[PDB]
Every structure is written in C-alpha cells, then in structure tokens.
Amino acid sequence: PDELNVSNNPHYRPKPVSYDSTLPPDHIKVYSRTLFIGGVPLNMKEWDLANVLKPFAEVQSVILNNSRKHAFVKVYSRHEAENVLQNFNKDGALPLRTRWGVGFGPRDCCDYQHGYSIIPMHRLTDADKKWSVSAQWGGTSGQPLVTGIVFEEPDIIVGEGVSSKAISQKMPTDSGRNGPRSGKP
16 A cells, blocks of 8 residues: 555635735734834935934835825834834934834734724725725725735725814903192192
C-alpha cells in the first residue's frame, strides 16, 4: 500500500468586507488610531511631516485629508512613535499637535461603552465607501479597499447643522447730579 495524499485546497483569494484577518500594512485604519498630526503650519505637504519625523523616528507613511488640517502617519516601530511624542509633545514649543493610539481589535463589545460613545473606526466606513465607492460606481467592491475596511454597515454620511447659542444685548448707563440752588441779597 501507499500513503498517497488526497487533500484538496484552492488558492488564496480576496475576502468580503467582513474579514479582519487579511489587512495590509498600508492604507488601513481599522482598530488603529495611529499617530495623528494636527495643526500643521504647512500647506498640506506630506513630505515636510516626514522632514520632521526623519530624525530619531521611523515614519514610512503620511496622509493629509480634509480642509481642516487633519493628518495621520504610520510608523514601523512603537519606540520611534514615542520619540515623536517626546519632542513634539514635550519640547514646550510644539509645532505640531501630535497624539497617538492603538486598538487591540476589540471582541464581544456588546456593551453600552460601545453604544453611547463615538469612535473613528466607523467614519472609515461611511467616508471611504461614499467618497471613493459612491460617486460613479455602486457601493461595496467598487474599489480595492474591500481588503482593509472590513465594515459593511448601511450607514452613510447624513446629518443637519444644529445651533443652541444664546446672547443678550446690553448698553451703558447715564446719570447726572444737579445740586440745589439758592438766591442772595
């Protein structure tokens, strides 16, 4: 007899927008708040944010989005991450508003601490599927971003402005003093 193999397994292929186990090391923001860069004095030049994360740091990706100076950068080491927050958050003359964070890929988060709290890991769903997969194409699988976002909720960017400001007008006061008057001989 012979111990011949009779197993069958097809080649690996892309996954639907629900598989948090095929994410690339680039162009991803699921469960990662990454190194945020705010208040950039620059005219949105991603090569100058690397020009200040060149020394004592290991940044290898920079992105600048929105007309409100919102940027994120990706580093290949968490020790060079803390070297950026060292200089750019403790030199007393911060040229950039640097903040960082990481998610451990939450599980069974069926709690009200994830039902009455906002998180950036849902603005990736409605802002990349609307503005890159809902302009001249149908949503879901209209772009290669279906291998990272892994969120497929029916929610889209919808809302209206609200104001609750209250003010009151005031004016200075005016007073005079006129003492008594008496005649004379």
